[PDB]
Each structure stands twice: as structure tokens, then as C-alpha cells.
């Protein structure tokens, strides 16, 4: 009746036999080991910086133990839910002869919140001077309280580099833009061994490992506030967004979803109003539509007519390429700041070509509006040429967003009071000497052909996965993704629990944009990230 896991009727090879004189022939041509070959060399793992600005006591590289320290093992660990044992390590420096300066390498035991200082060196410290040509080997034992670990456990032994003596370049004491790249390489000890096959297709409870938050091309990147493609990055001290910003608890303070679809609403207006209030059809929060934007008008205004752009407060209406000469393009319009949307005015008796939207969020006091710092089902704004009269002319509208109208303004997102928040606004400052960031895409204007910049807190694919999937990260940690241009100029992005990105420098410049990505582990928030650029 029962058939066990390995229970069947062996008829076997019908024409032949799985011989043994032959398999050993394949063996002797290629050589063998005990069913594994990644326990006899040092895989490459990563590389980091060591520049003159990193003074004494400061840290460069803390990664804890785990199979992530060997790319053969991160691969296999998708088969097992467990592990146990040590690692062998080799690091080195690609330094010149002039570049004096000394370095350290410590294994700190678990349950420690280390410090960017020098007191750690009173622990047993390894050395590696920059002048030292040959590498060094050492081990990382699994000093633990449990019989073993799980992949969702990140409270293990951990390696740390530390600047035992700072860097020196006697020559160029003008720019202080020096190098001394570091490398790290790993071999497991035979004590290492997985346990406990995970049933494939099965997740974990505490959460998965974040290694699909960012795609591997700029081509697949778009902003969490507008559908356009990335072009460049931005640093600010303060960063914030609420529209499509998700956290690792699958939550958000937003009203929207990680899509860019046409919006559908239902005007109901009369008397040639052209200033209706949109109610919702689809949503996740009642009242507010899904995909609705996050931006308020700058200030009060009264929509009657149409566009107007002038050089200055004494002169012309540029309407040509002779407009950059202004420098104070002032946008003295009927209206300002709105986001443009396509439209489809479906009303049972409006036999006319439908007309464009010009929406935002705002209070409708009267035929004028006023700014809505906060959103609600009453604070929804439209300015269409909806073909109406005395009579009520209800319609579904089926909007879809294209561009922007606030000519002359700065890149959206900076203006905090213009930004929309229901009740809460996720916000961050600097963190462990890093800096947060936005992601810069573009957006298109109404009158001129040009395009104003827009900020973004997340790539969209970073936001779809977090609405859906249950990732893991403790709050004091990041997800380190390494960003590389078409050159070998690269750096690293950390991502906190809230979803806000972080960076370990104060500038980028410009770079070969055909860029990629790759996951690299879990670094603390205190710690500075990498930066290998120019």
C-alpha cells in the first residue's frame, strides 16, 4: 500500500547497465575530491576603499558570518535552512609603495554593537600594512550559544576591519583623493556544513533575504513618484515621501500602489464650473484614488484662462528658445504647480473631443482653490474644459498622468510643505555619517518642450516587492547594493527598514549611466559605505 520515499520496483537499465569501470574513467581525467571543490580555494567576495579621510579607529567593512561570504554557498543556501561552522579568510591591499599606513582585522564575538574607535584593538588584532605584499590568512569560528543557526539569524560572529593607523600620501596634499583598495576572499573550513533541506518553493517565517530589491540595469528603473526613467542620483540631508513608499513591515502612510495606471474618477458639476471635485472609483484608502499624486500647489490662485510665461517682471512672454536669458522665469499664469493628466470625458451628451485635465490636490473654497498640505476626499482638484452648461453633467473621466505645469520651480520633493501627507510623513536625516538620497528622474512641462527634474525615494521595483513580500532587516542595518557604471567607478547603497536609501559619501558627479547592481550583504547603519569613484 504505502510507498516510501525510495520505494519502487527496479527493472533498471533495459539495454545496458550503469557500469563502474567507466565512471572512474571520467574521474581520472578530471580529478576529484570528497564531493566538493569549494573547500580548497579562496573565492573572491568583494572590495572596498581606504582613503585618507578615514582617520584612526574608523571602520570599513563589517559583515557577519554566514554563507553570504562565499558565492558558492549563497547559491547552495537556497537549498538549506541552516548552517554550522567556520570560514577561512584572505584579505589584501592593492597599494603602492609610497602609501604607508596600517590596517587591522578583528573577529568580534556576537552580541556586540561595536564602535568606530580604537578600543576594539585591545582585542586580539591582526595587522596588514599597506607595504605588505603577501596576503594573510585567518579564520572566523562560529562562536555561538545554539546548536546551530538559521539563515534568518544574524547575531553571529562578525569580521571587522579597523584603521590601526591612518593613510598617508606624502605627494598630493592638495586634493586628498587617494585609493588603497582592499579585497576579501573566503574559503570554508571542513567544519562547515549545512543542515535541514528547505522544501523548495517554501519561504521563511522571520523573512527572506533581500537580494531582489533593485534590478540589474538602469533600464528597469523608474521612480516611485513618476513613471519616467532614472538619470542620476541626488543627496540631501533630509528625505521624505509618502505616495508609494513602503517599509519592510509591508506598510505605508500612502494612499497609492506601486503602479502607474490611468486614474478613474467621477466629476459632477454644473454652471460651467470647470473646477470640479473628483470622487474615487478604485482605491486602497477610502475617498482617495489610487495612483493619485503627492504634490500641493505652491499658493492660492484662480483658474480661468490658459498659459503665460514671461522673461522677468519688466519684459516679454518669451515663447521661444530665447528664454534661458531670463534666469528668473516667473510663470505668471492662470494657474501653477498642477500635474497634467490625459482624459476621457464620458458623459452621455458631450459629443465633443474630450480635453485635458490639469489636476492636483487642494481645497475648493470657491471658484478659487487653496493649498492642501494634507489629503482628504474633499481636497481633490481638477481644471478641465468639461463641456457643460447650466445643467449637471456627470461623467467618468479616466485620467492618466503625463507631465507638470509649475514652470520655473525647483525639482519636486524639496518643497516639504507642498508635499502631501495624510497624517504621517516618513523622514530621515544623516545616519552613521552616511547621507540619505532621492532618485532623480525627469518630468515634462506644459508649454515649452523642456523637462524639469523630479525626486524619488525608491525605484518602483523596490516598492512592488515590499508591498508584497516579507523581507528581513533589523532596524540598525542596511541592505548593501553595489552600483557600478560602465566604467569601474562604483559605490554602495544601503537601505534601511523604512525604504529610504542611504549613501556613504556627499557627492557623485556624473557617470556612465548604463549602470548595474548586486546584493552584497547586511551592513550596520553606523558604518560608512564604499565609494570607488575617480
Amino acid at each position: 500500500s504505502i510507498t516510501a520515499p525510495e520505494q519502487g520496483t527496479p527493472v533498471g537499465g533495459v539495454i545496458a547497465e550503469p557500469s563502474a569501470q567507466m565512471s572512474a574513467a571520467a574521474d581520472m581525467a578530471t580529478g576529484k575530491s570528497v564531493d566538493s571543490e569549494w573547500e580548497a580555494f579562496f573565492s573572491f567576495h568583494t572590495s572596498v576603499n581606504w582613503s585618507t579621510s578615514e582617520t584612526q579607529g574608523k571602520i570599513l567593512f563589517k559583515q557577519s558570518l554566514g554563507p553570504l561570504l562565499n558565492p558558492y554557498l549563497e547559491h547552495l543556501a537556497k537549498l538549506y535552512v541552516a548552517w554550522s561552522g567556520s570560514i577561512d579568510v584572505r584579505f589584501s591591499i592593492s597599494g603602492s609603495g609610497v602609501f604607508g599606513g596600517k590596517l587591522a582585522a578583528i573577529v568580534v564575538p556576537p552580541g556586540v554593537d561595536p564602535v568606530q574607535s580604537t578600543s576594539m584593538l585591545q582585542y586580539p588584532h591582526v595587522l596588514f600594512d599597506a607595504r605588505q605584499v603577501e596576503p594573510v590568512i585567518f579564520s572566523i569560528p562560529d562562536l555561538r550559544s545554539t546548536l546551530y543557526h538559521l539563515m534568518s539569524d544574524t547575531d553571529t560572529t562578525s569580521l571587522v576591519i579597523m584603521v590601526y593607523n591612518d593613510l598617508i600620501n606624502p605627494y598630493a596634499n592638495d586634493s586628498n583623493s587617494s585609493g588603497c583598495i582592499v579585497t576579501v576572499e573566503t574559503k570554508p573550513g571542513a567544519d562547515f556544513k549545512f543542515h535541514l533541506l528547505k522544501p523548495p518553493g517554501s519561504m521563511l517565517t522571520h523573512g527572506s533575504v533581500p537580494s531582489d530589491l533593485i534590478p540589474k540595469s538602469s533600464s528597469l528603473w523608474i521612480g516611485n513618484r513618476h513613471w519616467t526613467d532614472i538619470t542620476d542620483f541626488v543627496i540631501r540631508p533630509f528625505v521624505f515621501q509618502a505616495n508609494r513608499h513602503f517599509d519592510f513591515n509591508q506598510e505605508t502612510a500612502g494612499w497609492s500602489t506601486p503602479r502607474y495606471r490611468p486614474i478613474t474618477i467621477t466629476i459632477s458639476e454644473k454652471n460651467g464650473a470647470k473646477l470640479g471635485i473628483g470622487v474615487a472609483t478604485d482605491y486602497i484608502v477610502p475617498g482617495i484614488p489610487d495612483g493619485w499624486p503627492d504634490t500641493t500647489i505652491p499658493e492660492k490662485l484662480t483658474p480661468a484662462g490658459d498659459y503665460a510665461i514671461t522673461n522677468k517682471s519688466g519684459n516679454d512672454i518669451t515663447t521661444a528658445a530665447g528664454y534661458d536669458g531670463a534666469d528668473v522665469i516667473v510663470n505668471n499664469t492662470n494657474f501653477k504647480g498642477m500635474y497634467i493628466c490625459g482624459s476621457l470625458q464620458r458623459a452621455w451628451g458631450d459629443k465633443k473631443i474630450s480635453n485635458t485635465a490639469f489636476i492636483t490636490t487642494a481645497t475648493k473654497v470657491d471658484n478659487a482653490i487653496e493649498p492642501s498640505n494634507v489629503i482628504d476626499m474633499t481636497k481633490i482638484a481638477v481644471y478641465q474644459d468639461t463641456h457643460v452648461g447650466k445643467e449637471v453633467q456627470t461623467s467618468d473621466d479616466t485620467l492618466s498622468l503625463l507631465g507638470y505645469t509649475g514652470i520655473g520651480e525647483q525639482a519636486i520633493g524639496s518643497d516639504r510643505d507642498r508635499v502631501v501627507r495624510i497624517s504621517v510623513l516618513p523622514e530621515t536625516g544623516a545616519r552613521g555619517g552616511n547621507h540619505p538620497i532621492f532618485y532623480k528622474n525627469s518630468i515634462k512641462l506644459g508649454y515649452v518642450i523642456r523637462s524639469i527634474d523630479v525626486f524619488n525615494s525608491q525605484i518602483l521595483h523596490t516598492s512592488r516587492q515590499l508591498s508584497l513580500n516579507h523581507y528581513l532587516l533589523p532596524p540598525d542595518s542596511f541592505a548593501v547594493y553595489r552600483i557600478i557604471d560602465s566604467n569601474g567607478s562604483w559605490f554602495d547603497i544601503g537601505i534601511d527598514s523604512d525604504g529610504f536609501s542611504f549613501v556613504g559619501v556627499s557627492s557623485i558627479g556624473k557617470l556612465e549611466f548604463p549602470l548595474t547592481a548586486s546584493y552584497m550583504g547586511i551592513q550596520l547603519a553606523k558604518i560608512r559605505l564604499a565609494s570607488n569613484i575617480r
Binding site: 454652471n271 483658474p303 484662462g305 503665460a308 514671461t310
Partner: protein
Amino acid sequence: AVYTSEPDVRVPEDKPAKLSCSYSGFSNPRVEWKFAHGDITSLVCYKNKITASYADRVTFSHSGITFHSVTRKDTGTYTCMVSDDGGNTYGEVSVQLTVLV
């Protein structure tokens, strides 16, 4: 060089209205708006500035004006008059506003 985006306008009562004066080729222009309906007339702007009679319900821009609201009384014809400070250069445009009572 003066022109508009909308030489004629049609609106109901009580609702807004915008009226353009798209000037160009000037240095320090001075501007005027004048009502006109039949033989009735009144200066609405003067020296880039609104009168005291209409300032409550009317705005101003160099690229036009915007009424916070209207009545049927504003039915008629307006006109923008430009002049460079110096009497050097000149232009105009005349607009008819009909309310849809």
C-alpha cells in the same frame, strides 16, 4: 508686439475669467486696462496697477488679468494698452467678454 490667446470669451455669471495682454519688445512698460460697453467706460488698471474700484474682485499680471468672479455688468469690451516708459514703443489688443446669462 501685443496679442492674446483668446480674443473672445464666454462665461456664466459669478464665475472667473482671465484676460491676456501678451506684450513683447519692451523695456519698462506701463499698462492699462479699460472697460468698454456701449458708451460706458472705466479704467481698470493704471501703471501696472488696479484701481481701488475693482481691486477686491480683480487681480493683475503683466501677462494678463484674472477676475476672482464676475457679474453680467462686465459684459462688453475690454482693451489692453501698453507703452514703454518713454513713449517709445506701443501696442494694443481689444477683447470682448460676453457673460452667458
